[PDB]
Each structure stands twice: as structure tokens, then as C-alpha cells.
């Protein structure tokens, strides 16, 4: 009955990492609430190009935050022991 939330900038790194713990969850327990998507945050920063005048030229950068959460349905003693023993790629967000 836990809940883990994944918040990484690149969808490849997190969705691969979530595909690991979701596998370790099956070994620890059959009852697993697998990875599931949530809407992704986007933000935009419209910084201006020229060092001086010419107000009509800018350049827009963005910064997403892909999200995914994993939970537990009817966990066992293995869940508490076998969860914290993993290190994920630097960028993946862990919060149980």
C-alpha cells in the first residue's frame, strides 16, 4: 500500500527505470499497480535574441517534466525491504 512518484525530464530514462522496479515489484508481489501516465508540465521562456534593439526577434526554450506513479495493492514484507535497495539514473525522482 505504498505510492512512488516518478518525475524525470526525459521520457526515455524514467520509463526505462520504471520498467525495472515494476519488474522487481512482480517478483516481490503479484499485486502490482503498474506504471501509469499523468499529464506532463510544460513551461516556456521567451528570451530576447539581440543584445540591444530589434524587439521582434526572440528565442523560446521549454522544459518538460514527464510524470509517472507506481503504487502497491496488497504488499508484503518484501516491499519495504526490496524497494530502497535500488539506485536509479540521475534525473529520476523517487518519493515513496
Amino acid at each position: 500500500k505504498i505510492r512512488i512518484r516518478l518525475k524525470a525530464y526525459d521520457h526515455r530514462i524514467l520509463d526505462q527505470s520504471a520498467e525495472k522496479i515494476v519488474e522487481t515489484a512482480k517478483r516481490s508481489g503479484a499485486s502490482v499497480s503498474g506504471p501509469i501516465p499523468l499529464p506532463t508540465e510544460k513551461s516556456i521562456y521567451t528570451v530576447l535574441r539581440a543584445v540591444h534593439k530589434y524587439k521582434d526577434s526572440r528565442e523560446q526554450f521549454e522544459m518538460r517534466t514527464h510524470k509517472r506513479l507506481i503504487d502497491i495493492v496488497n504488499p508484503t514484507p518484501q516491499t519495504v525491504d526490496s524497494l530502497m535497495r535500488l539506485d536509479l539514473p540521475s534525473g529520476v525522482d523517487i518519493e515513496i
Binding site: 525530464y9 516556456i44 521562456y45 528570451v47 530576447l48 535574441r49 543584445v51 528565442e59 523560446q60 526554450f61 521549454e62 522544459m63 518538460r64 517534466t65 534525473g91
Partner: protein, 60 residues
């Protein structure tokens, strides 16, 4: 009269209102984005090289 004033930005004034924000690499007064503390020209010049994570060019 420029490098004098960065000390004015840094030191705690006698009224919260006096206190403003300036870029944390080149002390440019205007256009400082608070999530980064960088001015407009610092912010772009690092984004290309790639010091700021997550940020990337946005076609859409």
C-alpha cells in the same frame, strides 16, 4: 560607476523595498528570471552550451 553597485545589490538595505534583483553572473539589473537568477543574455548563452538541465529549444 558599475562594479561599485553590485555591493549595493548584495548588502541588506534599511528597508525591504530598496532591495531588488540582478543577474548572478554579470550584474545586469533588468530582466532577471527568478527561477534561474540569470539575466536574459546569460540565460541563453548557457542554454546553448547546456549547463541548464531540462531546458531545450522548443519547436513546439
Amino acid at each position: 560607476a558599475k562594479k561599485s553597485m553590485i555591493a549595493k545589490q548584495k548588502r541588506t538595505p534599511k528597508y525591504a523595498v530598496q532591495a531588488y534583483t540582478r543577474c548572478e553572473r554579470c550584474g545586469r539589473p533588468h530582466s532577471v528570471i527568478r527561477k534561474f537568477k540569470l539575466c536574459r543574455i546569460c540565460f541563453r548563452e548557457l542554454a546553448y552550451k547546456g549547463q541548464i538541465p531540462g531546458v531545450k529549444k522548443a519547436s513546439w
